[PDB]
Amino acid sequence: ILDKIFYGVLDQGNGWLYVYETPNQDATYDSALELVGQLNKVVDQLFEKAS
Amino acid sequence: DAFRLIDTGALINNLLNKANIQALIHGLNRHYYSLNIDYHKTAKETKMLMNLHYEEKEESNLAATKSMVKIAEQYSKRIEEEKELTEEELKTRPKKHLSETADETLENNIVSVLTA
Amino acid sequence: TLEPSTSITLAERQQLAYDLSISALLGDKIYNFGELLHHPIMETIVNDSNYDWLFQLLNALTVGDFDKFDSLIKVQISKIPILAQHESFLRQKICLMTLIETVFVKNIRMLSFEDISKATHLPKDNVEHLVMRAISLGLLKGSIDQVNELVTISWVQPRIISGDQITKMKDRLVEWNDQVEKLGKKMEAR
Amino acid sequence: SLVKLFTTNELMRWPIVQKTYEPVLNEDDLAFGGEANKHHWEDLQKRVIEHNLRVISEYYSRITLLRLNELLDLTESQTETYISDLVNQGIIYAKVNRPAKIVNFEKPKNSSQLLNEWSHNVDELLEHIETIGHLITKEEIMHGL
Amino acid sequence: HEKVTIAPLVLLSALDHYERTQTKENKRCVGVILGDANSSTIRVTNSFALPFEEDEKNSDVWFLDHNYIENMNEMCKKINAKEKLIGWYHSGPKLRASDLKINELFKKYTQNNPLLLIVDVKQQGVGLPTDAYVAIEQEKTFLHLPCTIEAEEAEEIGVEHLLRIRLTNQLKSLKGLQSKLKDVVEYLDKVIHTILGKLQDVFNLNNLQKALTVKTNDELMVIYISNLVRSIIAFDDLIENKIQNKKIQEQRVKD
């Protein structure tokens, strides 16, 4: 589970394996984060030149 | 273009002047000349030409529907194009091109929000 | 084909009608007793003498009584092994159509085990097996969720022959038109 | 009728059918000529069991575990093994509640999956409007008369 | 897909037909449409008027020239080879019973199911005003086919040369609903079939859509957040433009 090949969990409180897997969505935290980083740099460069 | 040869009988005022054209039709009958163009048309013809551009309703809407089905993918490719655009401008510090690429991406998003 | 032209002799209507009545009971192939109302097999010819069975078939399907099914059949039609299974199929289809119309008034299609068990007059377990046979055929295109005890149904019903349905439709057509009209108003505005 | 038995199947059908009919269903006479009557039974057994689960995934949406084993007429262990083999083959996908006796017939979702369904209802609606247009045109002409 | 493409020349020739034959009082005027429609995509490329005379208390009395279709078609062949018989045109504004008898005439001389093109000439419809129909078996009955414009790269420039979304889509839809309603009220008067079946069906398939629109909103909200970013990228190019301008301006003052 730590390697994350199949998403289950272990239930120590009763001694079962329980379905952790119903999935996430990718590529939307990631998409934004990239766009943001480039943009801040591009603004900074241009500002030095202007002034 | 619209043409006629020398043919006279009214064209006798046609090809500080006036010696020329009298001698021009007297030395030679039949030599080309251009003529002027105008277009006159009719209002029902006119309206027909503009209603080219409910079948209409069906089509615009059809594309709108199918655009919305596929948007999950259309989303992904345009972030990738955008990611590229940002990077190019960094190196660059041309301008028209970088702007146009960003303008297309923005136009498309508005149309997509509008669709639902 | 027959009734407008070609073979309008009474003989030909009478044999063909008799075959129609025997086959409807044996089959379950196409809808119920609406098909019999629209086209004539008891009013180009006799209303009695093995067309008595038709009027009784209509009473039996709605009610769902097994006894009314037993009494209508006479020896020629009854002996045949085929009919009896197909009697249960016709009963579910008709009952199902009645409950569904009732609930349907916007988009409701949820009917319980309890509604269908009641209609057929069979306990739940018999119904479980029975619906399972009927979906196989594709007379039902809903789905049965065993442990919820609810049937969530995706339309399959024909909805045809109107008199009741038109009054209700008219009411709906008007409502929709209003809903759309407001949308239209907003666009017009900007 | 045997290929039809798999489609309607509740799996109480089969030994009555197997026993009643073998003119060609442990037998052949112009192909193998028979393989072994007991050995053909084996192939028949795995296919009917497998097919009863394939049709049940489509028809049902919940089933209890007690009810599924009852149809297969086998032990809970054995139903469990057939379910495992089938999800692996990936013809059907299901989820198992071993101690609480539910077999779900659910498989992944994303909102966009149901988006396509929304935009299919829109699509049935636009197409309806094209039919509606032509229909009105026909209807009027009859009204006049 | 089954499709008809109609030249502007066709419809302007129809526009001309109706005046040029002096057909008045909402009578029928008839001509032949020509193109290539050996396939299931009708390409309408040419047309001609046909002499037509109607009686003023009988429209099942008609005079239509059979020899003319045949004879003019031969002249058409000698001029271009694209210009075969595919159908006919009428001035509408509706279908008629008498439309069948003429359609039956054209059936011999065509190589596909005869096309009846209804060209409305009054120009008081919405959009492309023309509706296209093809006779098939039901008696015999006309059935709508999608009818769209044509293009030839010279022809479309010439169409423009002579002449030089959401609100519409939605308005046209309500317009439809309104018409559907009118037809129903008329039917109700008549009563006290196909139509009914269709109305019930539609209904079954705003209400049913409601639940799903809720899912759409979460995905749309991600799209709006995307918009927010996009404006900022564009904004970056705009800013740059202002600096370049600035440098020039400052230099200009100095000199």
PDB file of C-alpha atoms in Angstrom, chain D:
ATOM      1  CA  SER D   1     -31.981 -23.406 -27.671  1.00  0.00           C
ATOM      2  CA  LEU D   2     -28.789 -24.097 -25.663  1.00  0.00           C
ATOM      3  CA  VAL D   3     -27.179 -20.736 -26.732  1.00  0.00           C
ATOM      4  CA  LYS D   4     -30.619 -19.224 -25.784  1.00  0.00           C
ATOM      5  CA  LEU D   5     -30.368 -21.000 -22.316  1.00  0.00           C
ATOM      6  CA  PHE D   6     -27.269 -18.898 -21.451  1.00  0.00           C
ATOM      7  CA  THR D   7     -29.064 -15.588 -22.168  1.00  0.00           C
ATOM      8  CA  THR D   8     -32.224 -16.224 -19.898  1.00  0.00           C
ATOM      9  CA  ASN D   9     -30.223 -18.307 -17.394  1.00  0.00           C
ATOM     10  CA  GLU D  10     -30.902 -18.664 -13.571  1.00  0.00           C
ATOM     11  CA  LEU D  11     -28.623 -21.808 -13.424  1.00  0.00           C
ATOM     12  CA  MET D  12     -31.122 -24.333 -12.159  1.00  0.00           C
ATOM     13  CA  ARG D  13     -31.807 -25.003 -15.824  1.00  0.00           C
ATOM     14  CA  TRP D  14     -28.726 -26.894 -16.776  1.00  0.00           C
ATOM     15  CA  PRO D  15     -28.648 -30.602 -15.548  1.00  0.00           C
ATOM     16  CA  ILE D  16     -32.299 -31.054 -16.593  1.00  0.00           C
ATOM     17  CA  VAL D  17     -31.288 -29.715 -20.090  1.00  0.00           C
ATOM     18  CA  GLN D  18     -27.953 -31.573 -20.114  1.00  0.00           C
ATOM     19  CA  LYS D  19     -29.530 -34.860 -19.270  1.00  0.00           C
ATOM     20  CA  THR D  20     -32.527 -34.497 -21.527  1.00  0.00           C
ATOM     21  CA  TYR D  21     -30.391 -33.364 -24.470  1.00  0.00           C
ATOM     22  CA  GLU D  22     -27.154 -34.866 -25.605  1.00  0.00           C
ATOM     23  CA  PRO D  23     -27.857 -35.727 -29.359  1.00  0.00           C
ATOM     24  CA  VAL D  24     -24.694 -33.683 -30.076  1.00  0.00           C
ATOM     25  CA  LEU D  25     -23.998 -32.125 -26.604  1.00  0.00           C
ATOM     26  CA  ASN D  26     -21.407 -34.759 -25.327  1.00  0.00           C
ATOM     27  CA  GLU D  27     -21.340 -36.179 -28.819  1.00  0.00           C
ATOM     28  CA  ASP D  28     -20.422 -35.450 -32.369  1.00  0.00           C
ATOM     29  CA  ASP D  29     -20.522 -37.676 -35.389  1.00  0.00           C
ATOM     30  CA  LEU D  30     -19.001 -35.540 -38.210  1.00  0.00           C
ATOM     31  CA  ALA D  31     -16.258 -33.562 -36.437  1.00  0.00           C
ATOM     32  CA  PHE D  32     -14.458 -35.069 -33.434  1.00  0.00           C
ATOM     33  CA  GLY D  33     -16.896 -37.904 -33.194  1.00  0.00           C
ATOM     34  CA  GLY D  34     -16.817 -37.278 -29.449  1.00  0.00           C
ATOM     35  CA  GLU D  35     -13.923 -36.292 -27.283  1.00  0.00           C
ATOM     36  CA  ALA D  36     -14.934 -38.127 -24.128  1.00  0.00           C
ATOM     37  CA  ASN D  37     -18.487 -37.666 -22.780  1.00  0.00           C
ATOM     38  CA  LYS D  38     -17.246 -36.724 -19.211  1.00  0.00           C
ATOM     39  CA  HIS D  39     -14.628 -34.433 -20.617  1.00  0.00           C
ATOM     40  CA  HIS D  40     -17.122 -32.431 -22.719  1.00  0.00           C
ATOM     41  CA  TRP D  41     -19.186 -31.960 -19.485  1.00  0.00           C
ATOM     42  CA  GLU D  42     -16.356 -30.191 -17.919  1.00  0.00           C
ATOM     43  CA  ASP D  43     -16.270 -27.507 -20.716  1.00  0.00           C
ATOM     44  CA  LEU D  44     -20.016 -27.147 -20.542  1.00  0.00           C
ATOM     45  CA  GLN D  45     -19.961 -26.648 -16.799  1.00  0.00           C
ATOM     46  CA  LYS D  46     -17.460 -23.793 -16.743  1.00  0.00           C
ATOM     47  CA  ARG D  47     -19.225 -21.867 -19.705  1.00  0.00           C
ATOM     48  CA  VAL D  48     -22.803 -22.027 -18.144  1.00  0.00           C
ATOM     49  CA  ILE D  49     -21.546 -20.793 -14.768  1.00  0.00           C
ATOM     50  CA  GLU D  50     -19.508 -18.049 -16.402  1.00  0.00           C
ATOM     51  CA  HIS D  51     -22.430 -17.000 -18.611  1.00  0.00           C
ATOM     52  CA  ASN D  52     -24.929 -16.932 -15.748  1.00  0.00           C
ATOM     53  CA  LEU D  53     -22.651 -14.227 -14.038  1.00  0.00           C
ATOM     54  CA  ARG D  54     -22.195 -12.282 -17.339  1.00  0.00           C
ATOM     55  CA  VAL D  55     -25.966 -11.770 -17.847  1.00  0.00           C
ATOM     56  CA  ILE D  56     -26.504 -11.054 -14.068  1.00  0.00           C
ATOM     57  CA  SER D  57     -24.038  -8.118 -14.128  1.00  0.00           C
ATOM     58  CA  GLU D  58     -26.119  -6.394 -16.798  1.00  0.00           C
ATOM     59  CA  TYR D  59     -29.555  -7.216 -15.399  1.00  0.00           C
ATOM     60  CA  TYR D  60     -28.958  -6.539 -11.727  1.00  0.00           C
ATOM     61  CA  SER D  61     -27.396  -3.596 -10.002  1.00  0.00           C
ATOM     62  CA  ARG D  62     -27.300  -5.003  -6.506  1.00  0.00           C
ATOM     63  CA  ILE D  63     -27.472  -8.695  -5.629  1.00  0.00           C
ATOM     64  CA  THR D  64     -26.924 -10.329  -2.276  1.00  0.00           C
ATOM     65  CA  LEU D  65     -24.193 -12.948  -2.020  1.00  0.00           C
ATOM     66  CA  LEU D  66     -26.641 -15.537  -0.640  1.00  0.00           C
ATOM     67  CA  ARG D  67     -28.865 -15.029  -3.582  1.00  0.00           C
ATOM     68  CA  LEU D  68     -25.964 -15.333  -6.185  1.00  0.00           C
ATOM     69  CA  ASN D  69     -24.747 -18.632  -4.782  1.00  0.00           C
ATOM     70  CA  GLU D  70     -28.281 -19.928  -4.719  1.00  0.00           C
ATOM     71  CA  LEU D  71     -28.601 -19.329  -8.506  1.00  0.00           C
ATOM     72  CA  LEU D  72     -25.239 -20.981  -9.246  1.00  0.00           C
ATOM     73  CA  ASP D  73     -26.111 -23.878  -6.889  1.00  0.00           C
ATOM     74  CA  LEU D  74     -22.638 -23.973  -5.558  1.00  0.00           C
ATOM     75  CA  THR D  75     -20.860 -23.063  -2.351  1.00  0.00           C
ATOM     76  CA  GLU D  76     -19.924 -19.472  -1.428  1.00  0.00           C
ATOM     77  CA  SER D  77     -16.202 -20.392  -1.900  1.00  0.00           C
ATOM     78  CA  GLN D  78     -16.838 -21.659  -5.416  1.00  0.00           C
ATOM     79  CA  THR D  79     -18.984 -18.605  -6.469  1.00  0.00           C
ATOM     80  CA  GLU D  80     -16.194 -16.478  -5.010  1.00  0.00           C
ATOM     81  CA  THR D  81     -13.570 -18.316  -7.272  1.00  0.00           C
ATOM     82  CA  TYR D  82     -15.686 -17.879 -10.444  1.00  0.00           C
ATOM     83  CA  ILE D  83     -16.197 -14.172  -9.630  1.00  0.00           C
ATOM     84  CA  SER D  84     -12.371 -13.813  -9.210  1.00  0.00           C
ATOM     85  CA  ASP D  85     -11.611 -15.455 -12.553  1.00  0.00           C
ATOM     86  CA  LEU D  86     -14.152 -13.329 -14.425  1.00  0.00           C
ATOM     87  CA  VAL D  87     -13.004  -9.988 -13.017  1.00  0.00           C
ATOM     88  CA  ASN D  88      -9.510 -10.976 -13.961  1.00  0.00           C
ATOM     89  CA  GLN D  89     -10.518 -11.818 -17.564  1.00  0.00           C
ATOM     90  CA  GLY D  90     -12.051  -8.387 -17.543  1.00  0.00           C
ATOM     91  CA  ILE D  91     -15.293  -9.199 -19.206  1.00  0.00           C
ATOM     92  CA  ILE D  92     -17.162  -8.047 -16.223  1.00  0.00           C
ATOM     93  CA  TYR D  93     -16.142  -5.894 -13.319  1.00  0.00           C
ATOM     94  CA  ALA D  94     -17.817  -6.181  -9.861  1.00  0.00           C
ATOM     95  CA  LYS D  95     -16.935  -5.448  -6.188  1.00  0.00           C
ATOM     96  CA  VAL D  96     -17.111  -8.122  -3.411  1.00  0.00           C
ATOM     97  CA  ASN D  97     -18.489  -7.768   0.202  1.00  0.00           C
ATOM     98  CA  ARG D  98     -17.373 -11.098   1.782  1.00  0.00           C
ATOM     99  CA  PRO D  99     -18.644 -10.525   5.302  1.00  0.00           C
ATOM    100  CA  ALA D 100     -21.682  -8.407   4.708  1.00  0.00           C
ATOM    101  CA  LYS D 101     -22.980 -10.566   1.703  1.00  0.00           C
ATOM    102  CA  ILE D 102     -23.356  -8.072  -1.076  1.00  0.00           C
ATOM    103  CA  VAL D 103     -21.968  -8.290  -4.577  1.00  0.00           C
ATOM    104  CA  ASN D 104     -21.956  -4.843  -6.091  1.00  0.00           C
ATOM    105  CA  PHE D 105     -21.879  -4.529  -9.888  1.00  0.00           C
ATOM    106  CA  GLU D 106     -20.149  -1.167  -9.685  1.00  0.00           C
ATOM    107  CA  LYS D 107     -17.037  -0.023 -11.576  1.00  0.00           C
ATOM    108  CA  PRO D 108     -15.306   3.481 -11.721  1.00  0.00           C
ATOM    109  CA  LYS D 109     -17.051   6.847 -12.273  1.00  0.00           C
ATOM    110  CA  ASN D 110     -15.996  10.343 -13.270  1.00  0.00           C
ATOM    111  CA  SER D 111     -18.484  13.257 -13.624  1.00  0.00           C
ATOM    112  CA  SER D 112     -17.536  13.481 -17.329  1.00  0.00           C
ATOM    113  CA  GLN D 113     -18.951   9.963 -17.870  1.00  0.00           C
ATOM    114  CA  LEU D 114     -22.408  11.262 -16.869  1.00  0.00           C
ATOM    115  CA  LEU D 115     -21.711  14.476 -18.832  1.00  0.00           C
ATOM    116  CA  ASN D 116     -21.819  12.372 -21.993  1.00  0.00           C
ATOM    117  CA  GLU D 117     -25.188  11.028 -20.882  1.00  0.00           C
ATOM    118  CA  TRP D 118     -26.543  14.587 -20.281  1.00  0.00           C
ATOM    119  CA  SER D 119     -25.286  15.654 -23.747  1.00  0.00           C
ATOM    120  CA  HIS D 120     -26.810  12.354 -25.192  1.00  0.00           C
ATOM    121  CA  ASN D 121     -30.284  13.456 -23.707  1.00  0.00           C
ATOM    122  CA  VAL D 122     -29.647  16.900 -25.415  1.00  0.00           C
ATOM    123  CA  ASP D 123     -28.766  15.076 -28.501  1.00  0.00           C
ATOM    124  CA  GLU D 124     -32.051  13.005 -28.414  1.00  0.00           C
ATOM    125  CA  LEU D 125     -33.791  16.401 -27.807  1.00  0.00           C
ATOM    126  CA  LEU D 126     -32.192  18.318 -30.838  1.00  0.00           C
ATOM    127  CA  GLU D 127     -32.908  15.369 -33.159  1.00  0.00           C
ATOM    128  CA  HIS D 128     -36.485  15.401 -31.747  1.00  0.00           C
ATOM    129  CA  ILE D 129     -36.866  19.067 -32.776  1.00  0.00           C
ATOM    130  CA  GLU D 130     -35.791  18.271 -36.439  1.00  0.00           C
ATOM    131  CA  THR D 131     -38.495  15.472 -36.489  1.00  0.00           C
ATOM    132  CA  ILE D 132     -41.002  17.914 -34.803  1.00  0.00           C
ATOM    133  CA  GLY D 133     -40.417  20.567 -37.536  1.00  0.00           C
ATOM    134  CA  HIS D 134     -41.150  18.186 -40.393  1.00  0.00           C
ATOM    135  CA  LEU D 135     -44.156  16.639 -38.437  1.00  0.00           C
ATOM    136  CA  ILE D 136     -45.805  20.104 -37.991  1.00  0.00           C
ATOM    137  CA  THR D 137     -45.441  20.712 -41.637  1.00  0.00           C
ATOM    138  CA  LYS D 138     -47.387  17.386 -42.435  1.00  0.00           C
ATOM    139  CA  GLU D 139     -49.997  17.890 -39.649  1.00  0.00           C
ATOM    140  CA  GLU D 140     -51.106  21.432 -40.781  1.00  0.00           C
ATOM    141  CA  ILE D 141     -51.969  20.386 -44.270  1.00  0.00           C
ATOM    142  CA  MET D 142     -54.301  17.655 -42.884  1.00  0.00           C
ATOM    143  CA  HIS D 143     -55.924  20.283 -40.387  1.00  0.00           C
ATOM    144  CA  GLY D 144     -56.960  22.535 -43.222  1.00  0.00           C
ATOM    145  CA  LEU D 145     -59.037  19.832 -44.868  1.00  0.00           C
TER     146      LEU D 145
END
